[PDB]
Design a protein around this ligand. Structure first.
Ligand SMILES: Cc1cc2nc3c(=O)[nH]c(=O)nc-3n(C[C@H](O)[C@H](O)[C@H](O)COP(=O)(O)OP(=O)(O)OC[C@H]3O[C@@H](n4cnc5c(N)ncnc54)[C@H](O)[C@@H]3O)c2cc1C
Ligand SMILES: Cc1cc2nc3c(=O)[nH]c(=O)nc-3n(C[C@H](O)[C@H](O)[C@H](O)COP(=O)(O)OP(=O)(O)OC[C@H]3O[C@@H](n4cnc5c(N)ncnc54)[C@H](O)[C@@H]3O)c2cc1C
Ligand SMILES: CCC/C=C/C/C=C/CCCCCCCC(=O)O[C@H](COC(=O)CCCCCCCCCCCCCC)COP(=O)(O)OCCN
Ligand SMILES: CCC/C=C/C/C=C/CCCCCCCC(=O)O[C@H](COC(=O)CCCCCCCCCCCCCC)COP(=O)(O)OCCN
Lengths: 425, 425
């Protein structure tokens, strides 16, 4: 029996388990799958033999993500610039300019005004308090409605919505304005920052850091799926699918929010949390790697397409590349290759689609979602409390970060807090 | 004896006198000089025979300036686009881009943040209340200090300061931040707007509108300088330099603020006003028309030069143009042609200066200034009251507009208010 059991071996679980270990605690890490890293998942390309790709999250920015930066520096993990954008192929109408910031002068005054409004609203958010605790209900409405009130002209309107579709992984009518504003706040109150944070990637894949961290964790069980967490007794009992139980003074739940509903908690989690946990968050982000021929290097496309964004990912050969598209799984079916072709050709009529690669995070029973994004109305009801302890059970992960939700940095941040909580218990 | 005497035949005096006349009042217009129009002064170029130029104010924007737009439409006065900018020759450092908005991407995040701060501060200003009545003292500090707090990188910093130098007609250490913010507010709370308002000019010169308005004013005396305004009696007595006096129930002072100190008021003006009136405002704007050879069409220069801005004014021939420079008379001596050459060559090393044309508004005893700009500390002490009546004496003009100070539109606006005041008396 253990000082702490950590459930889930994503970056959150990994940090917590490592850090508690180095604090001299006796720790066990239980991972349901056959790998560590969770929604950070580097692996071989399905389309291009020998080519490593990121099929989950990977993009980082050292300045927005200091914990991550610290980890990289700690283990000497090399990073590289994200693919540069040099050729612009937007679908934003005839008045758009083909650069990274495609807003024409005729829209400048509109954009000035909207910048003030957006930032004013974002500045309503204290990142420490929780989105439920700040009288922010009026902002927790469908993004399309919020944006309609901004009355933006066509280029800026669609540019904003496209990036929002990318970043939230929800269509505009499902996304919450408040959450959009949360992301703005998270990036030191910057709209620009949200997209500029696509700055660097792992030179050798995210697995590089995963492996470095795991090497400092002495006891790990893979293929071990937690089904119950019971703290009715003096010591927490953790039940497992096909397995003897394990026991600890403290348990850290570092599994994805949308999977908590599959664990039996005893006693039941506090009532305020229960509805959101049952329903799950609304994240439907879909990241598709597209093997192509006939694409020049350095392409970026933003527009009104079913792929809001489509852009350069990596060189494969002189003639071939990977692009990456973002959309959502509600709106798009990646098993329909005809649909993929149409989506690509809309932006890039000269380009041949050779194949695609993605992971269906939503269908994955260890995840039941990509990155976090609330349904409208969820997080102005309950948010901070999702990441707060219930007795000896802690809750960590990107999904519950107040500071950087939906990012690796939020995984690290939340772990820190739990580790500290436990050490001072 | 008259219902109203209007003193000064700028646009303010002209509107007031016309409008009171058409309301069936008996009006006299007293003008000190040999012309009407005041600080709107179209005339023949000193450098290029047969060429009409504006030596005072002229630029308008129908959307920011609805009264002016109404006057133009009233009399069928043709306007034309201000000279277009197509060749950019900035002095903003090596990272600047040569377009009208020269901010590079590397500065974008800085500019986003400053945009919020600037607009937040400007939104503190209610345009109806007066700058002295709103607890705005903290902003009434030297512009350089305010801008220092913004911590802008080099291109945006200098771009802002250059345009501010142009627009306020004061060096940064003399300009008031609060006034800068006033101009922003005046332009529907837009920084961009301040410069985009340089939109159109009079096709046939500002005199076109001056003449149209004056034709509706039946009694005008030129070369008639008011030296005294005495309302101790039942009827206001207006004394004149070399002249019998004139008498009226109401007097409208539509002379420039910096000249009021030359009139004897009886009784004395209200005490709060007296200090500012004695000292005068701090406006030192200097608009220099520069006859050049070797300049391509469509040039715009903004930078750190003693001319903050230097830009295309009009074609003269295939080889010759006029440019226009803005600076201030504290900082620059336009009688020093060597200085002019150096100032121009800084931006445009290929260009030969043939000559210059300007009017020394500061030395002109009928003006004692170009357009209004307060000294630091003036207008957070007293502002609205400068434009309020003292018994039967009204005060109008651009200089005292709360809504559009320093612009033709402010002349029209202030006149409206006085006319209405008088009609409802
Ligand atoms: C498509 C996609 C793109 C992304 N893009 C970026 C990006 O660009 N930059 C960025 O910073 N982030 C990005 N992310 C978000 C980021 O990857 C995640 O938020 C982060 O990796 C989550 O780490 P975590 O430790 O909270 O959870 P996870 O990594 O999800 O770890 C959860 C662990 O729980 C395990 N588990 C689940 N149920 C059980 C159970 N019952 N018992 C035992 N173990 C269980 C899972 O197998 C897993 O290993 C992206 C995510 C996705 C999916
Ligand atoms: C260099 C310069 C550039 C400008 N640029 C622009 C611009 O781009 N766009 C814009 O809208 N505005 C501009 N303006 C500002 C605008 O021109 C003025 O604010 C406006 O014309 C003032 O009109 P007014 O009726 O208040 O005063 P004025 O036009 O000054 O009229 C005052 C009248 O009082 C007369 N007078 C003075 N003393 C006496 C006396 N004691 N007795 C009798 N008569 C007297 C003067 O002769 C004058 O005719 C500019 C001004 C200058 C000087
Ligand atoms: C009283 C002091 C006032 C100081 C004014 C400084 C700012 C005035 C800028 C005036 C020039 C604007 C030109 C319009 C752009 C244009 O036409 O050229 C455009 C540039 O416009 C854009 O690309 C959109 C920019 C969006 C900016 C919105 C944020 C407001 C910025 C605030 C500025 C603050 C500066 C320092 C803080 C590009 O090419 P095109 O035209 O062929 O497409
Ligand atoms: C969660 C939803 C988030 C939505 C994000 C939408 C906005 C993200 C924009 C991301 C792209 C930024 C690229 C940086 C510019 C660049 O590199 O290219 C630059 C363009 O940058 C500039 O010229 C300065 C622009 C100043 C803008 C400041 C105002 C903020 C605008 C807010 C945006 C709002 C849009 C709709 C309201 C030009 O060429 P260069 O780089 O060779 O010099």
């Amino acid at each position: 029996m253990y000082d702490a059991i950590v459930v889930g071996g994503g970056f959150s679980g990994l940090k917590a388990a490592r850090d508690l270990t180095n604090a001299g605690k006796k720790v066990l890490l239980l991972e349901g799958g056959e790998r560590l890293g969770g929604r950070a998942y580097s692996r071989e390309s399905r389309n291009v033999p020998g080519l490593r790709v990121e099929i989950g999250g990977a993009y980082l920015h050292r300045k927005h993500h200091p914990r991550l930066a610290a980890e990289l520096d700690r283990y000497g993990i090399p990073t590289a610039a994200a693919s540069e954008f040099t050729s612009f192929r937007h679908r934003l109408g005839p008045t758009a300019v083909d650069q990274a910031f495609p807003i024409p002068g005729s829209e400048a005054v509109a954009v000035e005004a909207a910048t003030y409004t957006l930032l004013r609203d974002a500045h309503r958010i204290d990142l420490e308090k929780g989105l439920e605790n700040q009288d922010l209900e009026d902002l927790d409405i469908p993004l399309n409605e919020y944006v309609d009130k901004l009355d933006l002209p066509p280029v800026s309107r669609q540019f904003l919505l496209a990036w929002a579709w990318n970043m939230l992984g929800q269509p505009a009518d499902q996304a919450s304005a408040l959450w959009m504003l949360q992301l703005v706040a998270a990036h030191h109150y910057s709209i620009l920052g949200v997209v500029l944070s696509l700055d660097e990637v792992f030179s050798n894949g995210s697995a590089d850091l995963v492996d470095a961290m795991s090497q400092e964790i002495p006891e790990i069980r893979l293929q071990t799926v937690v089904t119950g967490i019971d703290q009715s007794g003096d010591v927490v009992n953790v039940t497992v699918k096909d397995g003897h139980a394990f026991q600890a003074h403290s348990v850290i739940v570092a599994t994805p929010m949308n999977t908590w509903r599959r664990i039996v908690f005893t006693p039941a989690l506090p009532e305020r949390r229960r509805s959101v946990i049952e329903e799950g968050h609304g994240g439907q982000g879909l990241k598709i790697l597209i093997h192509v021929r006939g694409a020049e290097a350095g392409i970026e496309c933003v527009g009104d397409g079913i792929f809001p964004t489509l852009y350069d990912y990596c060189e494969v050969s002189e003639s071939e590349r990977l692009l990456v598209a973002f959309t959502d799984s509600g709106s798009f079916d990646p098993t329909d290759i005809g649909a993929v072709k149409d989506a690509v050709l809309y932006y890039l009529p000269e380009v041949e689609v050779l194949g695609i690669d993605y992971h269906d995070w939503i269908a994955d029973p260890l995840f039941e979602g990509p990155w976090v994004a609330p349904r409208v109305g969820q997080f102005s009801r309950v948010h901070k409390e999702l990441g707060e302890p219930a007795g000896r059970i802690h809750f960590v992960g990107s999904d519950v970060s107040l500071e950087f939700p939906g990012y690796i940095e939020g995984a690290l941040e939340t772990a820190e807090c739990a580790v500290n909580a436990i050490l001072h218990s």
